[PDB]
Design a protein around this ligand. Structure first.
Ligand code: SRM
Ligand code: SRM
Ligand code: SRM
Ligand code: SRM
Ligand code: SF4
Ligand code: SF4
Ligand code: SF4
Ligand code: SF4
Ligand code: SF4
Ligand code: SF4
Ligand code: SF4
Ligand code: SF4
Lengths: 363, 417, 363, 417
């Protein structure tokens, strides 16, 4: 017989609520009822209510079981997650919505919300996309879960209500290879090192393929040392990216006192109103201060509140900056421009700036 | 307290990951105490202890992992080892299994209970819903449990396969699309599932120079962040006119400041409103979605639907972070998606032949040029692929474009040309 | 005595027209009379009329003497040239304004024009800035003076009027070394080679600074063969710039039949309304056609007249493009976008795109 | 006809360069026939013949030149040789002499007649008014005439020195500025002359890794194209309020569509007009010149005047063409310009020490980084130097910015750091 392989995920159509399966591709319109609660009206006349809750992403299977009981009770045994790791339930009986919202809160402690309404132009703050940090990853500069919790505690009011004038995505990356779309987010928290690696010659010899380790360095700071069969680093050229350690255990560069996070700002992914853009650094560095990361949390909050108090309806961070310029942005946010913030990343070709990185074009 | 630093993170209104870990620890330990078949009762507590020490030290305690996998697959399981092995032996081995999600992360309770039962038996009880790529994460297991966990996943009433990792086609992902969304321009969930299934081998058995990622967005809003987080971004669009319900616009006009919140905010000024009639110059529209986003009861995507393909999207490493750029302005998205599959296959063949170790498709195109890439996918150069023509005259000309001359004869005679 | 040195050019202030000398830095307002004629007013209350004429740049000393003969009984012995190789005059009594314009036309054949009035919003065409071509240069792909003459014949009337929506500058370079404001002009003509260089091993060993010839290749197509003692060329990597010939007389990439000119478009220098811009290739190649360069002239006119037709008042070419997009630009100009127009010049860094290449900022 | 191809270019309304060459040939030959002391009577005719052959062949007939100069100078004269030596011996040697122009190309008839007399005696009679950098071009002479031509130029009643060429400070140039222009933010002509004079040695005797160019523009209109054509672009500006004559604006308002031609065209929307009062938010103004350009009788640059310095401007070669970028947001321009001179000198010292063979300042800055460049000129980093903060986290940190740690001690102990 043999062990079954190559069969794939379960086919999603077998897993849709009956009303969603029936009305698939046949929707009239949606209406954001209140924070966390979206009404979807089908051409058939069916109405379904998609109720959303924030989550820590790391879930206990015991939490998943609890969510499942609730699903059976209010949404006929069907739920989904979103692409930012919120969870959603489907309710047909409008008089039952608040029962679900309160039962989720009581039973698992997940807040209803994470939504936004372009129609009246009022927006919540959704979940923070984040990676593994110290929970499971071997190359992090910062801790993902802790920072997310610490920032969501401070900004909690914004998840539960539509209090902002435009979309604001906050994303975290625990190192520079930025698992997630952190590099294109309104506010990105990105962990970095500031110390160069110390070649461990014994470990390099045993475990590292030299030529590919050398080729992984964007700055050409590594050279092979044929004589001692190892790698040499030119510290003048190292900018502590960490890539060589991804490739080679004999190239660690962690410094618990100089590791920390940079804060970048002004990413957009949607096409609406203006083109997508990658985030840009505005705070070079803040230290890791577990368990609450107060310096980092304070700057995130400082940036958000400044944009929120001045942005017009629909104006995301980068649209705000589009209007007022960076001179005023640094002034209004109370941030310092320093030389660190002038791009010196040499390998990236100018020509990419001339490519259309967007689906906005005329037919 | 055993964990005074992590306890701080049980305070505050936002739901706590620490609570998630402790809940798992208590109930996994309890399950094993009741005689349930649980192989890793202490895994979650061990994780907690390590994480506390990591908070104290402000550094990771995970080391470079040995390479591990399930029988027949070369990908989808990440080996992970703790440098705190002798002190905390229950997390010495603590591997991650990436489990392929249903398209758009739709589930039923039965499906999820299956996963919870297998993971309870074989793993730590800790999961991520979901991994950033889209997969369900089975967070923490030993080497000798990987295979029998996989056997059980496959034998479930609603069975689940492993997703991708390493130098392979990663688990594709998609936004809710037409399941819930009236803005959807094609069936994202169907395309996603179809690719996952067509390319099982590519996904389970890494054979390429590096990883490759596909993501499917039903419309320009790009609710799966495909253009930044996938190498091959399939984004819904249309070719004809936005459909306008005039009476619905008037209903909006009674309360909405349409001039300021819609008209003045269109990037191209293609939409106008005079008090009675809404007008859209679709020749000038760039399908940015704003006006439709603003007035979903009145405005709709046109009937001639498909996708724009954006190529290259990636994280920084090596040559810089990339938001994908236009490779194919328009392609049809119709089962069995032969046009899209031909493009993928052409790209993979070329990339496997020309790519360097750990070179992403984006970097290859940068190194080989757009000309080579377009001839690989057999498409013509289009002005919509650039934000602007080149700002320098340093153009390559192909042999066949040159006028015959004494000089071209000289090149031919030398053996160059 | 010996031979005196390090004395420099004459002090300009001694070479000033009385009224200009008197009212230095003390002007009230300028007014463009007609085309070619700008009236100037000073705080004191004195009026001088600048009268501008087009010149072929390359001048006989006999044409210069004859410019001097004119200058005396019209401009009190004084005159200037402009940054665009135009000769200006300074006239006082302004009944005499118009027979000036005539005797110049009678004696040297230089036409009055080359001006513009931003105020009303009526711009005329000015002289083309350029280099030597085959008159004196050793690296050229095209011929400046010639193409200039040909284009300026088909574009005479514009220069002699303000038949233009906005300001448009045309510039010419004879090779990729690109002398003049060709990299930033509204319209630009650039000598290009389309043919690799065949090594002349015979004279590479007597002349040519070999490792610096190899170092001066932007794409790295040159490898220093040591055998043999010559330079071998990887044709795969050569984009036929002609820079290696500037470094070494034994690298002729000259193929008369394939050498031609690219046409680039939409460069800006002034800060007005929008930030300055580098020019972009829109026509890859037109042939060398002595004596009248029809194909070249045809495309320059086609492009000029298309923007002319469609542009708003003060809407320069790059500004027009901002409005319509490149999609509509090619359609309207009748030009074809080809793969040649997608940038692939690797060496330029992306971070330059982030630098403020402009005086426009806030205090 | 001897020149059937070039004769075509005597047709047409635009003044003819062929006519310029023929006129020179005829009158130089006539001058020599009348017994005037003319050393090169046939030079211009020889040029014509060569050019005709070049029109026939569609290629240059000039070869790589031997290096030549006048006594005491290493630059300002370009050697040029014809590959048609035997056939046309009168242009076998045909060198160019670059003659330093007066600031802003201002002349008197006496000054010009001097030049005409020297060049008639020693050269072809062919000139360029002017060379692209700004110099008067003496087009075509032999090696043995270079020195005595120079002696005569220096002995003229109004004497002219040689300009720059090679790896030196090139002849600076300047817009008309305070001579004719009411926009002038500083005395461009004076600054230009002063620099030319201060750095005569740097200009006459090339000592640097490559060439270096300075250009002076009176206001942001940049009438000498300094930002694209000079390494060091000195462009006039102001710090205070635009001066507004309100009654003059009203005079404009009677005929000018100020709303459409001025208000809507301001890049930052700092200027407003309501029918009675014109208003400018100088906090929002970027001094683009448009509004002033539009209404010179009403609007003026502020009183706190100076210059912004743009660094790096150059043609493509090696690393790409450059419009200069912000190096110094504001500097005073006051005789004897010590602040500007200190900047230049610091830059040259650094560039001469660190620069590679044929590396331009712009390329050096790109290679060494803006940090190093700013500490060389002794200035602080300013947000006005960038169009946007960097789009990646890959920052260099200086040793002194790091917290002391066991790791920093380790680096110190190894000898790195
Ligand atoms: C549920 C979810 C889809 C899914 O398959 O999971 C989703 C669903 C919708 N998105 Fe989205 N978007 C979802 C992630 C996104 C993200 C992707 C991300 O953040 O990683 C963005 C791209 C972010 C960016 O641009 O940087 C996204 C950009 C949008 C846009 C852009 C708004 C803007 O002004 O730029 C629209 C417009 C709108 O506000 O109606 C939109 C609107 C919508 C609409 C209104 C479409 C519709 O007709 O129903 C859906 C209701 C959302 C709402 O709250 O109003 N959706 N949408 C997404 C889960 C997020 C969550 O839990 O919070
Ligand atoms: C004569 C000359 C100065 C000199 O020292 O030689 C000059 C003189 C003036 N320029 Fe200019 N510009 C001169 C070269 C330039 C060039 C530089 C170049 O082309 O190489 C341009 C920069 C081109 C670019 O931006 O790409 C230039 C950009 C301007 C600007 C820009 C107009 C715009 O809309 O961008 C102003 C605005 C204006 O039109 O009033 C201007 C306006 C002026 C004003 C009106 C200033 C004033 O207040 O009097 C001067 C009268 C000229 C006129 O025709 O109205 N001048 N100015 C220039 C010689 C050119 C010629 O003979 O045609
Ligand atoms: C599991 C996951 C984080 C999470 O908790 O969500 C993850 C985790 C790791 N990623 Fe990733 N990446 C995860 C999604 C991403 C994404 C986003 C996406 O796929 O949607 C990106 C950006 C897009 C891209 O790939 O460019 C991403 C970009 C990277 C980078 C960058 C490679 C590059 O070309 O720049 C590294 C480096 C590498 O490839 O070795 C990397 C490598 C890694 C390693 C193997 C760490 C390392 O340095 O070797 C990961 C270890 C985690 C562990 O052992 O527990 N991961 N990583 C994410 C995948 C789960 C899933 O399958 O759903
Ligand atoms: C190739 C090189 C550098 C070199 O010496 O090898 C070069 C060489 C040269 C020199 C070579 C030398 O220094 O002996 C010659 C010979 C051509 C060649 O490619 O070798 C030359 C003819 C001119 C001429 C005509 C003189 C004549 O009769 O030939 C002029 C006009 C003039 O005299 O003012 C001229 C003015 C520029 N020349 Fe020039 N010139 C170059 C650019 C320039 C411009 C565009 C400067 C710039 O980089 O912005 C000049 C025009 C703008 C300006 O205001 O300076 C240039 C590339 C710059 C780079 O780094 O990319 N060159 N350039
Ligand atoms: S962002 Fe960095 S630390 Fe975080 S999971 Fe990805 S590779 Fe590991
Ligand atoms: S940390 Fe980065 S810059 Fe430093 S040596 Fe390694 S790859 Fe190179
Ligand atoms: S990408 Fe478009 S179709 Fe998909 S959920 Fe978002 S708005 Fe809907
Ligand atoms: S889709 Fe965008 S560009 Fe088109 S009409 Fe709507 S808002 Fe305007
Ligand atoms: S460097 Fe180029 S543009 Fe300048 S004279 Fe020589 S061939 Fe002409
Ligand atoms: S023409 Fe240019 S690219 Fe080709 S070998 Fe010479 S320097 Fe290199
Ligand atoms: S740069 Fe300014 S001061 Fe100089 S001529 Fe032009 S407008 Fe006048
Ligand atoms: S100078 Fe320019 S930016 Fe400033 S108010 Fe006038 S038009 Fe606007």
């Amino acid at each position: 017989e043999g062990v079954k392989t190559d069969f794939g995920p379960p086919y999603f159509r077998d897993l849709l609520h009956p009303v969603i399966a029936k009305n698939y591709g046949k929707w009239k319109y949606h209406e954001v009822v209140k924070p966390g609660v979206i009404k979807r009206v089908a051409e058939s006349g069916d109405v379904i209510y998609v109720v959303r809750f924030g989550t820590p992403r790391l879930l206990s299977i015991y939490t998943v079981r609890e969510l499942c009981d609730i699903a059976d009770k209010y949404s006929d045994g069907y739920l989904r997650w979103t692409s930012r790791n919120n969870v959603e339930f489907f309710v047909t009986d409008e008089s039952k919505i608040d029962d679900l919202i309160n039962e989720v809160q009581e039973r698992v402690g997940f807040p209803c919300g994470g939504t936004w309404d372009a129609v009246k132009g009022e927006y919540g703050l959704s979940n923070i996309v984040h990676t593994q940090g110290w929970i499971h990853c071997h190359t992090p500069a910062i801790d993902a879960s802790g920072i997310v919790k610490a920032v969501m505690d401070e900004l909690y009011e914004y998840f539960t209500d539509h209090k902002l004038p435009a979309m604001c995505r906050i994303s975290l990356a625990c190192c520079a290879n930025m698992c997630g779309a952190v590099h294109a987010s309104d506010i990105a928290i990105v962990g970095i090192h500031r110390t160069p690696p110390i070649p461990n010659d014994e470990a390099i010899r045993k475990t590292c393929e030299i030529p590919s380790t050398v080729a992984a360095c964007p700055t050409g700071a590594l050279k092979p040392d044929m004589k001692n069969k190892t790698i040499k680093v030119d510290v003048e050229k190292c900018m502590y990216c960490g890539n060589c350690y991804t490739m080679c255990p004999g190239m660690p560069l962690f410094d618990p006192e100089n590791d920390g996070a940079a804060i970048m700002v002004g990413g957009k992914l949607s096409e609406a109103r203006r083109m997508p853009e990658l985030s840009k650094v505005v705070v070079p560095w803040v230290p890791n201060e577990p368990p609450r990361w107060p310096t980092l949390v304070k700057y995130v909050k400082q940036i958000l509140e400044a944009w929120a108090a001045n942005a017009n309806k629909h104006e995301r961070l980068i649209e705000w900056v589009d209007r007022i310029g960076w001179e005023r942005f640094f002034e209004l946010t109370g941030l310092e421009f320093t030389q660190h913030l002038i791009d010196d990343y040499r390998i990236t070709p100018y020509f990419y700036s001339e490519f259309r990185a967007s689906t906005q074009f005329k037919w | 307290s055993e964990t005074p630093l992590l306890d701080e993170l049980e305070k505050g209104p936002w739901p706590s990951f620490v609570k998630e870990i402790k809940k798992t620890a208590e109930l996994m330990e309890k399950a094993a105490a009741e005689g349930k078949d649980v192989k890793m009762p202490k895994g979650a507590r061990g994780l907690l202890k390590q994480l506390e020490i990591s908070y104290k030290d402000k550094k990771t305690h995970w080391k470079h992992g040995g390479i591990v996998s399930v029988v027949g697959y070369g990908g989808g399981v990440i080996g992970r080892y703790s440098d705190l092995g002798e002190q905390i032996p229950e997390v010495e081995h603590f591997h991650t299994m990436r489990i392929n999600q249903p398209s758009g992360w739709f589930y039923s309770t039965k499906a999820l209970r299956g996963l919870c039962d297998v993971w309870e038996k074989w793993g730590s009880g800790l999961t991520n819903f979901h991994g950033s790529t889209g997969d369900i994460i089975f967070l923490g297991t030993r080497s000798e449990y990987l295979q029998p966990c996989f056997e059980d996943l496959g034998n479930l009433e609603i069975p689940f396969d492993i997703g991708g990792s390493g130098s392979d086609l990663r688990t594709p992902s998609a936004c809710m699309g037409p399941a819930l969304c009236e803005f959807a321009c094609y069936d994202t969930l169907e395309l996603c599932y179809d690719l996952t299934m067509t390319y099982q081998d590519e996904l389970h058995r890494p054979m390429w120079p590096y990883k490759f990622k596909i993501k499917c967005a039903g419309c320009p809003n790009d609710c799966v962040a495909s253009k930044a987080r996938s190498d091959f971004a399939i984004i819904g669009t249309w070719k004809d006119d936005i459909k306008v319900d005039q009476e619905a616009v008037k209903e909006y006009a009674s309360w909405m400041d349409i001039e300021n919140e819609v008209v003045k905010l269109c990037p191209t000024g293609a939409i106008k409103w005079d008090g009675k009639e809404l007008t859209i110059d679709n020749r000038e529209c760039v399908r940015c979605m704003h006006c439709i986003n603003k007035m979903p009861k009145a405005l709709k995507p046109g009937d001639e639907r498909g996708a724009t393909i954006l190529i290259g999207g990636k994280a920084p490493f090596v040559e810089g972070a990339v938001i994908g750029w236009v490779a194919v302005p328009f392609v049809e998205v119709e089962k069995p998606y032969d046009e899209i599959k031909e493009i993928l296959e052409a790209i993979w063949d070329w990339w496997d032949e020309e790519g360097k170790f750990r070179e992403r498709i984006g970097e290859l195109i940068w190194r080989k040029g757009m000309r080579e890439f377009l001839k690989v996918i057999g498409r013509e150069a289009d002005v919509r692929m650039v934000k602007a023509p080149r700002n320098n005259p340093f153009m390559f000309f192909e042999k066949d474009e040159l006028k015959p001359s004494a000089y071209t004869e000289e090149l031919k005679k030398r053996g160059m040309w």
